[PDB]
Write an enzyme that holds these catalytic residues in place. Structure first.
Site, PDB file in Angstrom:
ATOM      1  N   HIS A  61      -8.283   1.484 109.052  1.00 31.86           N
ATOM      2  CA  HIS A  61      -8.908   2.974 109.437  1.00 31.86           C
ATOM      3  C   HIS A  61      -9.030   3.921 110.506  1.00 31.86           C
ATOM      4  O   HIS A  61      -8.591   4.836 110.649  1.00 31.86           O
ATOM      5  CB  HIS A  61     -10.265   3.109 108.686  1.00 31.86           C
ATOM      6  CG  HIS A  61     -10.380   2.410 107.303  1.00 31.86           C
ATOM      7  ND1 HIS A  61     -10.881   1.282 107.296  1.00 31.86           N
ATOM      8  CD2 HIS A  61      -9.976   2.924 106.123  1.00 31.86           C
ATOM      9  CE1 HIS A  61     -10.959   1.010 105.853  1.00 31.86           C
ATOM     10  NE2 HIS A  61     -10.236   2.082 105.119  1.00 31.86           N
ATOM     11  N   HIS A  91     -15.232   4.095 118.451  1.00 26.16           N
ATOM     12  CA  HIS A  91     -13.902   4.517 117.645  1.00 26.16           C
ATOM     13  C   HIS A  91     -13.695   6.007 117.906  1.00 26.16           C
ATOM     14  O   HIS A  91     -14.539   6.656 118.387  1.00 26.16           O
ATOM     15  CB  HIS A  91     -13.999   4.020 116.450  1.00 26.16           C
ATOM     16  CG  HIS A  91     -14.915   4.853 115.677  1.00 26.16           C
ATOM     17  ND1 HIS A  91     -16.227   4.440 115.528  1.00 26.16           N
ATOM     18  CD2 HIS A  91     -14.921   5.999 114.977  1.00 26.16           C
ATOM     19  CE1 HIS A  91     -16.990   5.402 114.791  1.00 26.16           C
ATOM     20  NE2 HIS A  91     -16.132   6.163 114.551  1.00 26.16           N
ATOM     21  N   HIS A  93     -11.510   9.394 115.731  1.00 31.33           N
ATOM     22  CA  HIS A  93     -10.887  10.073 114.860  1.00 31.33           C
ATOM     23  C   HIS A  93      -9.923  10.952 115.389  1.00 31.33           C
ATOM     24  O   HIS A  93     -10.130  11.876 116.263  1.00 31.33           O
ATOM     25  CB  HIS A  93     -11.917  10.933 113.785  1.00 31.33           C
ATOM     26  CG  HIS A  93     -13.016   9.980 113.426  1.00 31.33           C
ATOM     27  ND1 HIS A  93     -13.034   9.312 112.238  1.00 31.33           N
ATOM     28  CD2 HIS A  93     -14.158   9.367 113.931  1.00 31.33           C
ATOM     29  CE1 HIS A  93     -14.119   8.810 111.822  1.00 31.33           C
ATOM     30  NE2 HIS A  93     -14.824   8.915 113.127  1.00 31.33           N
ATOM     31  N   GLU A 103     -13.862  15.550 113.562  1.00 30.36           N
ATOM     32  CA  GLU A 103     -14.858  15.418 112.252  1.00 30.36           C
ATOM     33  C   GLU A 103     -15.744  16.632 112.365  1.00 30.36           C
ATOM     34  O   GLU A 103     -15.482  17.750 111.534  1.00 30.36           O
ATOM     35  CB  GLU A 103     -15.409  14.222 111.894  1.00 30.36           C
ATOM     36  CG  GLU A 103     -14.289  13.253 112.010  1.00 30.36           C
ATOM     37  CD  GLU A 103     -15.096  11.918 111.293  1.00 30.36           C
ATOM     38  OE1 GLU A 103     -16.069  11.650 111.450  1.00 30.36           O
ATOM     39  OE2 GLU A 103     -14.422  11.942 110.131  1.00 30.36           O
ATOM     40  N   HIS A 116     -16.471   8.655 118.734  1.00 33.35           N
ATOM     41  CA  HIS A 116     -17.695   8.164 118.029  1.00 33.35           C
ATOM     42  C   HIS A 116     -18.338   6.855 118.893  1.00 33.35           C
ATOM     43  O   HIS A 116     -17.903   5.921 118.525  1.00 33.35           O
ATOM     44  CB  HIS A 116     -17.818   7.834 116.853  1.00 33.35           C
ATOM     45  CG  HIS A 116     -17.573   9.229 115.875  1.00 33.35           C
ATOM     46  ND1 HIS A 116     -17.432   8.973 114.590  1.00 33.35           N
ATOM     47  CD2 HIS A 116     -17.802  10.523 116.328  1.00 33.35           C
ATOM     48  CE1 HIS A 116     -17.218  10.370 114.233  1.00 33.35           C
ATOM     49  NE2 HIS A 116     -17.618  11.079 115.404  1.00 33.35           N
ATOM     50  N   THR A 195     -19.481   8.935 108.383  1.00 37.97           N
ATOM     51  CA  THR A 195     -18.545   9.498 108.059  1.00 37.97           C
ATOM     52  C   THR A 195     -17.459   8.920 107.275  1.00 37.97           C
ATOM     53  O   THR A 195     -16.372   9.611 107.009  1.00 37.97           O
ATOM     54  CB  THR A 195     -17.990  10.611 108.795  1.00 37.97           C
ATOM     55  OG1 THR A 195     -16.955  10.056 109.891  1.00 37.97           O
ATOM     56  CG2 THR A 195     -18.959  11.374 109.892  1.00 37.97           C
TER      57      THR A 195
END
Ligand SMILES: [Co+2]
Length: 257
Positions: A61, A91, A93, A103, A116, A195
């Site tokens: 992911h 991590h 996104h 996000e 994050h 999330t």
């Protein structure tokens, strides 16, 4: 299983995780014209001097840079928080294009990516217990825009080739997460959720106002990661972001005027 693809993306997650339609879901759009300054808030305290990074893992992911959280080594306190929150992992996104990837959004603006830094409340003893509590986690979110390189990110970028595919990990010791922070710790905060599935409503979000800049080359290397495992057809790890969810009966507070 859940993902970001064509048939298992965010719009499907509610079938397995009905809290996806809950009252405190994340991310959200941050409307800077309705967030209100809260003088009750304190400055953030980010204490990362004793951080012990361990490993970097492609989880299918995103990738997680993991820390030793068996002592108060890298902790977040202050701000909206009561007590001490230990860093477990960070991590990102990110998008397939520089115009999306974050996000949270700010007045509907999407950034190229979002960092994050995930922390859990030490009163609950471990992460798995913490995620079952409304005040279990504190996630420090930091926007990324494309511009100059971020020197403190480069060690992450250069290990990505070693963790291209799902389930690969590599040693990742002696990484200093302070090199990922912007100058200012001014922030917005609100109560929300993880999330990704299981989407638990256990997070005090702290989203920094000031983005960091990364280079186009740095982001391009993120986009070479794979969602797939080794020996499977290549699916680039891009667009691993959930869109903004309804704010519902929440207020976003600012630490700054
Ligand atoms: Co995240």
């Amino acid at each position: 299983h859940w993902g970001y693809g064509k048939h298992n993306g965010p719009e499907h997650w509610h079938k397995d995780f009905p809290i996806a339609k809950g009252e405190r879901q994340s991310p959200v759009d941050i409307d800077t014209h309705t967030a209100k300054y809260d003088p009750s808030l304190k400055p953030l305290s980010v204490s990362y001097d004793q951080a012990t990074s361990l490993r970097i893992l492609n989880n299918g992911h995103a990738f997680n840079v993991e820390f030793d959280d068996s002592q108060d080594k890298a902790v977040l306190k202050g701000g909206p928080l009561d007590g001490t929150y230990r860093l477990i992992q960070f991590h990102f996104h990110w998008g397939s294009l520089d115009g999306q990837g974050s996000e949270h959004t700010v007045d509907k603006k999407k950034y190229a990516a979002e960092l994050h830094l995930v922390h859990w409340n030490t009163k609950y003893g471990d992460f798995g217990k913490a995620v079952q509590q409304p005040d279990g986690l504190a996630v420090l979110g930091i926007f990324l825009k494309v511009g100059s390189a971020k020197p403190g990110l480069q060690k992450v970028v250069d290990v990505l080739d070693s963790i291209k595919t799902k389930g690969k990990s590599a040693d990742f010791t002696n990484f200093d997460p302070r090199g990922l922070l912007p100058e200012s710790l001014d922030y917005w905060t609100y109560p929300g959720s993880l999330t990704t599935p299981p989407l638990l409503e256990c997070v005090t979000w702290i989203v920094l106002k000031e983005p960091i800049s990364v280079s186009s080359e740095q982001v391009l290397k993120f986009r070479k990661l794979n969602f797939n495992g080794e020996g499977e057809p290549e699916e680039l790890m891009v667009d691993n972001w959930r869109p903004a969810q309804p704010l519902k009966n929440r207020q976003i507070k600012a630490s700054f005027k």
